[PDB]
RNA sequence: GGCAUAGUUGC
DNA sequence: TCTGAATTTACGGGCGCAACTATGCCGGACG
DNA sequence: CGTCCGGTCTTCGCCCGTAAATTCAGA
């Protein structure tokens, strides 16, 4: 019916064309009788009949009179839907200014006339004069006059001279402007002016003028002359208990504006003096402003009980607007709600639906079945039968519920698993019975949580629920490959209790012929559930070509393990049931089952494992008692000696040996050590609490203690909570962050005295407040991310590109936090990966690195792999399937169409709303140095002369196990590439001084130095040797601040020493703040220090990284390579100059004086090499190093936080978000295309233009990508609808209207708002048909 | 609480909110995102077009279900018509172009 | 409220997350039965017609 | 009854075209004129369509051929009564 | 049958 | 005495989702 | 009870971004 939406300014003629009648009277109803007034805001002859096919006068009341209009009162007899659609208009007695275009910041009227917003506001609100047609006088065009100056001009310039007041003057000024002349003049001024601020102002104003001329709109229409009126039914008056009416805000605003309008018209009729009519026009202007975005100027005019009235802009903007309240999310019929319940008898693919809710939801289907069987001819009879709840309706409900999946959806649907489909099962009650396993998916415990039901109706909806939304198909989370139906709390405890061994139990050592008789023994009570025995096992392995090969052996395990093994399917090895089976072990069991067998075996396995876990947890009777929280009886000595150490530290302090701060630190340190040691003693005494032996000598065993069993099993609780139960509950901090000196020394088993509880409640209140005020930030972040990556959809099957990012294991400085296994899993390789030995193609170029390939890759000790990434995919309007890779929700490649932007946004945002000197080598491995330029000095220690030298600890297989950063002037006791001994530090330096290490050997002659002004003389009395310290330009005297001292090495004769490798002399230009202990004329060596130069969060960090905020102290980088030189004498701050060998020599930079520099004056640096220290700006990274550098930086930085919080999300989601960030590119050279010089255009658009031009003879236009934050990336979208639904509705709509933008509605939010099939899943075929047909 | 079909609002022809009045649950924005992350297109369209505020759509859906046929006419949501009229109330001319 | 003989132990998963398993004795004795008084009012407004 | 659709998706490795073709088959079975090609076991048209795809006797192409043949038969028989 | 306030529940 | 830049200051926008109970309200001042 | 026009006192958060006004640093 339509494939695009346009916006543009509303000309008065077009506004009249919309309207079907003028509104003149500010009346609604009689308030005695409820017929509409003559021509009020609620009228009949203007907007339509009150009823359907019934006129106002009652003369004509039937369908036969469709179209005729009566003469008595002129109401066109038709439906009321027209009353819901027909609009009116108001003929304003004076022109009025549109408030959006006046105060859009920037103001369109403000910069279309190039006049300040203050001046335009002053002249619009009838308080300042503006001249028009200045003529041969002493006035300009846009100049502002006051009443005094206006009268002076009137008495001096009484000849032809125009200077009006209010909206009329603005309308005249706009009408007196031709776009082309101004545009050309502005282009010329832009070219010639050479300014940086005026050039920006111009290239904005020129852009506005080009936007106006390009579209069909005209500037003069931004001043209203006819006010559109909303249809009556969209601002209805609902009668209440009594004759009163519900005054809708729009009605009050319309009444005010029309009232002031009629007052102004009447005053104009009798020609009132100027002051009164100007005041009336000002009142009308204010009323119209209030009717539009109310609250921009002055105060929101209130109507009743001192609350601002909603205006139209306030009605289509914000959380309460029609966008986020009735378009992107709507109330839905065929829905319900209730409290949930466990119901553990259900299978994984069904949920227990209450009978009453089932009857209420499926009423139309029951009607249909009743009529199909003929039990009720008329719908009224079926409705009455259903209401009376006969005995036959229940059979109908059972017949229809058979294969009709329903959707269960908990309130905060953070991630896609928050909504899943189940087959209903009729349950007597009033509460939904939900399968226990999916509780982890919903994050829904059973402490009063409520879930909503939804009933799909269409065949497509039912098939979607069955094939996409059933819990059976949602086994693996979309964020990570781990299963999301891992048994949670009671199943895991049951299995842990089952699969365990004690030293001796009933019937220990007997040999069993199979699991079946093991169960027979346990049920009969002959042998305990946990008794070491020998069992004959038949484990089927599928090492053959898809055939299960049996194997019979005699395994030594326990009765419980065999009973469990009776449940496991054929294809799994027995070794996954020979262990204790904690939570992680069970999750790995399920994951391996999915990987090896398929889906149906894993679903049946989940059902059976839940059943057996519950059954044997019940049989275990694993309870908890106050005698189970055993105190460590030996903590008496520990607490006593800790008290003694703090007492002795106080003894030292009162003697005055130690001050207050160091005592505070030492006390905290000793108490932390005591707490850790008490916790360790408790945990040891608990895990080894039980010692059982009756057949001879004693033998220790892992305990049965309820708390320890329930913690080790991983069901609930961890080291922290178990520690807090028995051991001292640790260190608590005051809200200021100051940790209290005396922490809570009593656990929960012993009572917490009053002050300990007071500290504990500090902590708990802070935690709860942090939760309640961090959920807001998490919600905002996930909303922004979803609204960025929503249009991104997998369109192509393979982009056919040879680019990628070198995925490598990431080591923060300790052990391997994330192995290559998880970082290259399910990502198609970019280039062929050779064997580490010699050029053997181990894996092809374009294979999906599934589990076997990754395991083989690990087996061959491969450390570097390059894999196609979403960010480096050149597909237009989407990303190819191969670049994305594995689905991570299924075991296969991503399908063609499945939307990944929303999946990535939800996967990133879900964890947010829940939670968020010496190099001591640790392993035996080789040492290799990358980007190093070292020199051996006299003392035989290596000193490095580079800056980005990272020390890599290589192993015998060639992999790097540890990485560390080596600063400038670091001492290494070993050589490069020579295997070192792990256990002792390999690198040492001073983190408090920056050396001036040399490159040659000789003597010390201070050249270009004059004592008195260049340096300052310090005579240290406590050392006896003076110092020659250089002070800065503003710190040293005014005698020698124009020259920079140079330190040069000479021979025994006095001549200079040449640099090794270059012809120039080797001189070092010392900066200020240099501790040069050496005096003049002292011999030195190579690589010897001459002088010593002295010197975040959780969710906010992720938000700042994704918004691409510029850090406060960014590390300045070098745009282009070349030699480095200094410039002017610090005019404002130090200046730098970089000159390439044959490129742009005069490239310079402006560097602050107060920040320490990094590189010296004799280095040839490469682009992207750090020139200072501090956080690296993402914009600089993208501009200099490239796209891969910035995407890798962002991925690593966010993964740092998400791992520090103990969360796991695959890198695909971060990569696609980063891709969506850098969606805009700025042109630099026009090339042979038609783009402008420095406009910002979509990367895909310029790419396709260049692709078309290269195939032709012309030359494409080179572009420069720019990194945009998530907010700016989503706000600046090709289609205005998405951004308008996002924040800043007023500004986005103003932009679209001014530029006359056009919508292709190719996104997801946009189709959602329009209300058609999504171009993501099953609707992708329909949109393919759309693209085919046109 | 449950609801097949009952009274609707006035400004936007959507189901009422609450249980004191026989209303329906709110398919919030993140719920729509949950469907979009899925391959659920037809279910989403049925959710926010037929079952919410498409007067012709919901009437035809009800009658078809009564007849035993599970098929829908997408139509256009009336809430979008409300938004169009509200933007037109201003000087912003927004209209749906001919296909 | 009331107090009743409670036993801490997992029972066939019917107390999975925090759910509570109630014996039919508690219902029989009617010790959690609660009386709710609801007020309903109809008004005769002097409306037109 | 049905628990999974993994076999059907294995036979149509798209996971979305499966939904559309199954919906078309269910529509043809509900309006419907046609009858199940698999022994109906008291299941709704959705389950019948998915199982019938599982048997491997229907996909997009087979259904398109059947529809083309039906339209050809309508054209022929409608023509015989006309001329 | 829409707004405002208060309180409450799950996160 | 002018003039471009960087800085500072002013001011516009955002601050999660879902659900339930109650009350009070269309306005208080002239024929 | 029936109609009919509308403005003193209130601020009081945190963060970010962008545009307007002020101030360097010269020529
Ligand atoms: Mg809960
Ligand atoms: Zn009439
Ligand atoms: Zn690609």
A634-766: CATH homologous superfamily?
Answer: RNA polymerase Rpb1 funnel domain (1.10.132.30)
Contact A732, A760 (CB under 8 A): yes
- How far apart CA C13 and CA A613 sit, in angstroms, is 9
Can you tell me whether residue A1239 is helix, strand or coil? coil
Residue A1227, number of CB atoms within 10 A of its CB: 19
And the tokens for A1317? Answer: 């099939």
- How far apart CA A1007 and CA A174 sit, in angstroms, is 69
Q: How is residue A466 annotated by DSSP? A: I
Q: How is residue A627 annotated by DSSP? A: G
Residue with tokens 């949920």: A351
- How far apart CA C11 and CA A620 sit, in angstroms, is 10
Looking at the DSSP bridge assignments, the partners of residue A245 are: A239
Contact A451, A410 (CB under 8 A): yes
- How far apart CA A1066 and CA A1304 sit, in angstroms, is 65
Q: For residue D66, give every residue at least 6 positions away whose Cβ sits within 8 Å of its Cβ, in sequence order, or none.
A: none
* Residue among B22, B31, B30 nearest A454 (CA): B31
Strand F interface, A 1264-1293, C-beta < 7 A: 1287-1291
Under an 8 A CB cutoff, do A460 and B43 touch? yes
- How far apart CA A84 and CA A236 sit, in angstroms, is 10
Looking at the DSSP bridge assignments, the partners of residue A995 are: A1092
Residue with tokens 């227990």: A352
Show residues, CB within 7 A, near nucleic chain G. A 26, 31-32, 105-106, 110-111, 116-118, 201, 204, 252, 255-256, 259, 299, 301, 303, 1104, 1107, 1109-1110, 1128, 1131-1132, 1269, 1271-1272
In chain C, count of helices (H) and strands (E)?
Answer: 1, 0
Q: In this structure, is the CB of residue A233 within 7 Å of any atom belonging to strand E?
A: no
DSSP-derived pairing of the beta strands A419-427 and A350-354: parallel
A755 CB burial (10 A radius; 0-12, 13-18, 19+): exposed
Radius of gyration of chain B (CA): 15
Are C and A close enough to touch, i.e. 3+ CB pairs under 8 angstroms?
yes
Residue A1154, number of CB atoms within 10 A of its CB: 8
- How far apart CA A1164 and CA A1139 sit, in angstroms, is 10
User: How far, in Å, are A471, A500, A1210, B35, D12 from residue A419 at the CA level?
Assistant: 9, 37, 21, 8, 25
- How far apart CA A958 and CA A951 sit, in angstroms, is 14
- How far apart CA A432 and CA A438 sit, in angstroms, is 13
Q: For residue A440, give every residue at least 6 positions away whose Cβ sits within 8 Å of its Cβ, in sequence order, or none.
A: A484, A485, A486, A488
Contact A1223, A871 (CB under 8 A): no
Are B and C close enough to touch, i.e. 3+ CB pairs under 8 angstroms?
no
Under an 8 A CB cutoff, do A241 and C43 touch? yes
Q: What angle do CA A841, A886, D60 make, to 5 degrees?
A: 110
A1137 CB burial (10 A radius; 0-12, 13-18, 19+): middle
What number of C-beta contacts closer than 8 Å exist between A and B? 323
And the tokens for A923? Answer: 């392993």
As a whole number of Å, the end-to-end CA separation of chain D is 49
- How far apart CA A663 and CA A665 sit, in angstroms, is 5
Can you tell me whether residue A402 is helix, strand or coil? coil
And the tokens for A498? Answer: 């089952």
Helix axes A719-726, A660-687, angle to 10 degrees: 100
- How far apart CA A1179 and CA A1110 sit, in angstroms, is 8
Q: What are phi and psi of A94, to 5 degrees?
A: -140, 155
Can you tell me whether residue A1091 is helix, strand or coil? coil
- How far apart CA A129 and CA A162 sit, in angstroms, is 10
Residue B22, number of CB atoms within 10 A of its CB: 16
Q: For residue A1187, give every residue at least 6 positions away whose Cβ sits within 8 Å of its Cβ, in sequence order, or none.
A: A871, A872, A1222, A1265
A696 CB burial (10 A radius; 0-12, 13-18, 19+): exposed
Greatest CA separation for chain B: 47
Strand F interface, B 31-60, C-beta < 7 A: none
- How far apart CA A261 and CA A41 sit, in angstroms, is 14
Q: For residue A812, give every residue at least 6 positions away whose Cβ sits within 8 Å of its Cβ, in sequence order, or none.
A: A1200
* Residue among A436, A407, A442 nearest A422 (CA): A407
Strands (E), A620-749: none
Radius of gyration of chain C (CA): 22
- How far apart CA A968 and CA A1159 sit, in angstroms, is 10
Residue with tokens 């202007």: A285
Name the helix (H) or strand (E) containing A1215. Answer: helix A1211-1221
And the tokens for A1225? Answer: 């590119």
Looking at the DSSP bridge assignments, the partners of residue A553 are: A537
Cis peptide bond upstream of A184, omega within 30: no
- Concatenated DSSP letters of A894-937: PPSS-B-HHHHHHHHHHHHHH---EEE--S--EEEEES--EEE-
Of all nucleotides, the one whose C1′ comes closest to residue C39's CA is F22
Structure's resolution in angstroms: 3.8
DSSP-derived pairing of the beta strands A833-834 and A949-954: unpaired
Strands (E), chain B: 2-3, 26-27, 92-96
Can you list the alpha helix ranges (DSSP code H) found in A332-487?
A: 355-361, 363-372, 379-388, 391-401, 439-442, 459-464
The residue of chain A with its CA nearest to that of B43 is: A461
- How far apart CA A1066 and CA A1069 sit, in angstroms, is 10
* Residue among A522, A546, A547 nearest A535 (CA): A522
Contact A1200, A812 (CB under 8 A): yes
And the tokens for A53? Answer: 């096919």
Q: What are phi and psi of A90, to 5 degrees?
A: -130, 125
Greatest CA separation for chain D: 52
Name the helix (H) or strand (E) containing A230. Answer: none
And the tokens for A1113? Answer: 């102290």
Contact A411, B25 (CB under 8 A): no
Distance A223 CA to G5 C1' (A): 28
* Residue among A1290, A1239, A1297, A1298 nearest A112 (CA): A1298
- How far apart CA A863 and CA A1310 sit, in angstroms, is 44
Touching chains, A (3+ CB pairs < 8 A) = B, C, D
Q: For residue A696, give every residue at least 6 positions away whose Cβ sits within 8 Å of its Cβ, in sequence order, or none.
A: none
Q: Which of D15, D22, D24, D30 to mutate to test the interface with B (most CBs of B within 10 A)?
A: D30
And the tokens for A1319? Answer: 């171009």
* Total domains in the fold of chain D: 1
- How far apart CA A629 and CA A633 sit, in angstroms, is 12
In chain B, count of helices (H) and strands (E)?
Answer: 4, 3
Residue A117, number of CB atoms within 10 A of its CB: 16
- How far apart CA A1088 and CA A79 sit, in angstroms, is 96
DSSP-derived pairing of the beta strands A942-944 and A918-920: unpaired
The residue of chain C with its CA nearest to that of A610 is: C13
Q: How is residue A1334 annotated by DSSP? A: -
- How far apart CA A1026 and CA A1077 sit, in angstroms, is 7
Instruction: List chain A residues with CB under 8 Å of B62.
Output: 364
Touching chains, D (3+ CB pairs < 8 A) = A, B
Q: What string of H, E and C letters represents the secondary structure of A732-784?
A: CECCCCCECCCCCCCCCCCCCCHHHHHHHHHHHHHHHHHHHHHHHHHHHHHHH
And the tokens for A718? Answer: 């961890």
- How far apart CA A1227 and CA A201 sit, in angstroms, is 19
Q: What are phi and psi of B74, to 5 degrees?
A: -60, -50
Strands (E), A527-673: 532-538, 552-558
């Amino acid at each position: 019916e339509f494939d695009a939406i346009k916006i543009a300014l509303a000309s008065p003629d077009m506004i009249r064309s919309w309207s079907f009648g003028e509104v003149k009277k500010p009346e609604t109803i009689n308030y005695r009788t409820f017929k509409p007034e003559r021509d009020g805001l609620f009228c009949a002859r203007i907007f339509g009949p009150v009823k359907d096919y019934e006129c106002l006068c009652g003369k004509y009341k039937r369908l036969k009179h469709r179209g005729v209009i009566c003469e008595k009162c002129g109401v066109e007899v038709t439906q009321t839907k027209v009353r819901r659609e027909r609009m009116g208009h108001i003929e304003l007695a004076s022109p009025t200014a549109h408030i959006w275009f006046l105060k859009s910041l920037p103001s369109r009227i403000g910069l279309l006339l190039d006049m300040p917003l203050r001046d335009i506001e002053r002249v619009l609100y009838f308080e300042s004069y503006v001249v028009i047609e200045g003529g041969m006088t002493n006035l300009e065009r846009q100049q502002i006059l006051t009443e005094e100056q206006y009268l002076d001009a009137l008495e001096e310039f009484g000849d032809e001279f125009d200077a009006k007041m209010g909206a009329e003057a603005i309308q005249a000024l706009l009408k007196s402007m031709d776009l082309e002349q101004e545009c050309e003049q502005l282009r010329e001024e832009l070219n010639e002016t050479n300014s940086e601020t005026k050039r920006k102002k111009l290239t904005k104003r020129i852009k506005l003028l080009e936007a106006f001329v390009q579209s069909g709109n005209k500037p003069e229409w931004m001043i209203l002359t006819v006010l559109p009126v909303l249809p009556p039914d969209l601002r209805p008056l609902v009668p209440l208990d009594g004759g009163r009416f519900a005054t809708s805000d729009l009605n009050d605003l319309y009444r005010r504006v029309i009232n002031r309008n009629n007052r102004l018209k009447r005053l104009l009729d009798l020609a009132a003096p100027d002051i009164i009519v100007r005041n009336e026009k000002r009142m009308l202007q204010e009323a119209v402003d209030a009717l539009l975005d109310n609250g921009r100027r002055g105060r929101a005019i209130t109507g009743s009980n001192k609350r601002p009235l909603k205006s139209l802009a306030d009605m289509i903007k914000g959380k309460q607007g029609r966008f986020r309240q009735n378009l992107l999310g709507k109330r839905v019929d065929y829905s319900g709600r209730s409290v949930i319940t466990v119901g553990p008898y259900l299978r994984l693919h069904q949920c227990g639906l209450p009978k009453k809710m089932a009857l209420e939801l499926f009423k139309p289907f029951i009607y249909g079945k009743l009529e199909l069987r003929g039990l009720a001819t008329t719908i009224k009879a079926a409705k009455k039968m259903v209401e009376r709840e006969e005995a036959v309706v229940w059979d109908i409900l059972d017949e229809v519920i058979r294969e009709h999946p329903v959707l269960l959806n908990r309130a905060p649907t953070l991630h896609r698993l928050g909504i899943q489909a189940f087959e209903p099962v009729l349950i007597e009650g009033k509460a939904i019975q939900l399968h226990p396993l999916v509780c982890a998916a919903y994050n829904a415990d059973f402490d009063g949580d409520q879930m909503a039901v939804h009933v799909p109706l269409t065949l497509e909806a039912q098939l979607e629920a069955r094939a996409l939304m059933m819990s059976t198909n949602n086994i693996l989370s979309p964020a990570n490959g781990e299963p999301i139906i891992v048994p949670s709390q009671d199943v895991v405890l049951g299995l842990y209790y089952m699969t365990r061994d004690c030293v001796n139990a009933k019937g220990e050592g007997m040999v069993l012929t199979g699991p079946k008789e093991a169960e027979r023994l346990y049920r009969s009570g002959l042998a305990s559930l946990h008794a070491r025995v020998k069992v004959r096992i038949t484990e089927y392995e599928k090492d053959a070509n898809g055939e299960l090969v049996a194997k019979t052996s005699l395994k030594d395990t326990t009765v419980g393990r065999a009973i469990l093994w009776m449940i496991v399917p054929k294809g799994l090895p027995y070794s996954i049931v020979n262990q204790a089976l904690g939570k992680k072990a069970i999750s790995k069991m399920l994951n391996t089952c999915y990987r090896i067998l398929g889906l149906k075996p894993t679903v049946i396995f989940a059902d059976q494992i839940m059943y057996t876990g519950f059954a044997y947890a019940a049989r275990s009777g694993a309870s908890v008692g106050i005698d189970d929280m055993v105190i460590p009886e030996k903590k008496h000595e520990i607490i006593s000696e800790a008290e003694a150490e703090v007492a002795e530290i106080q003894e030292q302090f009162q003697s005055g040996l130690v001050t207050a701060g160091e005592r505070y630190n030492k006390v905290i340190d000793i108490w932390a050590a005591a707490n850790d040691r008490v916790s360790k003693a408790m945990m040891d005494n608990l895990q080894t609490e039980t010692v059982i032996n009756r057949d001879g000598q004693e033998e220790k065993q892992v305990s049965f203690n309820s708390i320890y069993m329930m913690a080790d099993s991983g069901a609930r609780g961890s080291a922290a909570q178990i520690r807090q139960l028995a051991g001292m509950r640790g260190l608590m901090a005051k809200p200021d962050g100051s940790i209290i000196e005396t922490p809570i020394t009593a656990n929960f088993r012993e009572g917490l005295n009053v002050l300990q509880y007071f500290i504990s409640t500090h902590g708990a209140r802070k935690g709860l407040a942090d939760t309640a005020l961090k959920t807001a930030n998490s919600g905002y972040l996930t909303r922004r991310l979803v609204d960025v990556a929503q249009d991104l959809v997998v369109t192509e099957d393979d982009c056919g590109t040879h680019e990628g990012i070198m995925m490598t294991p990431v080591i923060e400085g300790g052990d391997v936090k994330e192995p290559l296994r998880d970082r290259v899993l399910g990502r198609v390789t970019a280039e062929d990966v050779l064997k580490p030995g010699t050029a053997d193609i181990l894996v092809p170029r374009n294979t999906l690195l599934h589990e076997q390939w990754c395991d083989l890759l690990e087996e061959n000790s491969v450390d570097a792999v390059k894999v196609r990434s979403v960010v480096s995919c050149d597909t237009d309007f989407g990303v190819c399937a191969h670049c994305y890779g594995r689905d991570l929700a299924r075991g296969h490649i991503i399908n063609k169409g499945e939307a990944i932007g929303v999946i990535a946004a939800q996967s990133i945002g879900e964890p947010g709303t829940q939670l968020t000197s010496s190099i001591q080598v640790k392993n035996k491995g080789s040492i290799k140095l990358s980007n190093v330029k070292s020199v051996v000095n006299s003392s035989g220690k290596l000193v490095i002369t580079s800056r980005n030298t990272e020390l890599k600890l290589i192993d015998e297989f060639g992999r790097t196990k540890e990485s560390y950063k080596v600063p400038y002037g670091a001492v290494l006791a070993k050589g490069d590439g020579e295997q070192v001994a792990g256990g002792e530090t390999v690198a040492n330096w001073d983190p408090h001084t920056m050396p001036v290490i040399t490159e040659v050997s000789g003597f010390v002659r201070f050249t270009d130095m004059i004592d008195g002004q260049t340096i300052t003389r310090q005579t240290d009395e406590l050392t006896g040797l003076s110092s020659l310290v250089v002070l800065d330009s503003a710190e040293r005297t005014a005698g020698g601040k124009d020259l920079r001292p140079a330190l040069k090495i000479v021979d025994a004769q006095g001549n200079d020493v040449l640099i090794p490798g270059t012809d120039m002399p080797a001189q070092y230009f010392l900066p200020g703040k240099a501790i040069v202990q050496l005096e003049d004329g002292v011999q030195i060596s190579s690589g010897d220090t001459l002088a010593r130069i002295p010197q975040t969060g959780g969710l906010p960090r992720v938000a700042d990284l994704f918004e691409a905020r510029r850090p406060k102290e960014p590390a300045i980088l070098a745009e282009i390579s070349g030699i480095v030189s200094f410039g002017k004498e610090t005019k404002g701050k130090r200046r730098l100059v970089i000159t390439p060998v044959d490129g742009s020599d005069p490239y310079e930079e402006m560097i602050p004086k107060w920040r320490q520099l990094n590189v010296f004056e004799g280095e040839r640096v490469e682009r992207g090499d750090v020139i200072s220290d501090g956080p690296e700006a993402p914009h600089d990274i993208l501009r200099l190093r490239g796209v891969h550098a910035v995407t890798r930086y962002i991925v690593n930085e966010v993964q740092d936080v998400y791992r520090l919080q103990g969360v796991k999300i695959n890198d695909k989601h971060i990569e696609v978000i980063v891709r969506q960030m850098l969606r805009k590119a700025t042109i630099v050279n026009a090339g042979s295309s038609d783009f402008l010089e420095g406009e910002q255009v979509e990367y895909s658009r310029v790419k396709i233009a260049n692709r078309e031009l290269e195939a032709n003879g012309k030359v494409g236009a080179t572009y420069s990508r720019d990194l945009l934050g998530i907010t700016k990336a989503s706000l600046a979208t090709e289609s205005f609808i998405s951004a308008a639904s996002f924040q800043e509705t007023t500004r986005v709509l103003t932009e679209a209207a001014v530029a006359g933008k056009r919508d292709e509605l190719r996104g997801l939010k946009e189709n959602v708002i329009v209300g058609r099939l999504i171009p993501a899943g099953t609707g992708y075929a329909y949109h393919q048909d759309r693209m085919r047909r046109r | 609480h449950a609801r097949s079909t009952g009274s609707y609002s006035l400004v936007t022809q959507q189901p009422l909110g609450g249980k004191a009045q026989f209303g329906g649950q709110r398919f919030g924005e993140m719920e729509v995102w949950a469907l979009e992350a899925y391959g659920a297109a037809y279910t989403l369209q049925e959710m926010l077009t037929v079952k919410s505020d498409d007067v012709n759509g919901r009437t035809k859906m009800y009658k078809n279900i009564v007849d035993g046929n599970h098929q829908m006419e997408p139509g256009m949501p009336e809430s979008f018509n409300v938004l169009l009229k509200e933007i037109r109330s201003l000087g912003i001319n927004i209209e749906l172009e001919d296909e | 409220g009331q107090n009743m003989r409670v036993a801490f132990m997992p029972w066939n998963g019917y107390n999975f997350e925090d759910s509570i398993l109630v014996s039919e004795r508690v219902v029989q004795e009617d010790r959690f039965t609660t009386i709710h008084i609801q007020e309903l009012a109809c008004v005769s407004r002097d409306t037109k017609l | 009854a049905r628990v999974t659709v993994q076999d059907a998706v294995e036979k149509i490795g798209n996971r979305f075209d499966l939904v559309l073709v199954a919906a078309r088959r269910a529509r043809q079975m509900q309006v419907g004129g046609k009858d199940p090609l698999v022994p109906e076991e008291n299941d709704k048209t959705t389950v019948i369509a998915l199982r019938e795809i599982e048997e491997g006797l229907i996909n997009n192409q087979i259904l398109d051929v059947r529809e083309r043949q039906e339209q050809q038969e309508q054209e022929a028989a409608e023509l015989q009564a006309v001329t």
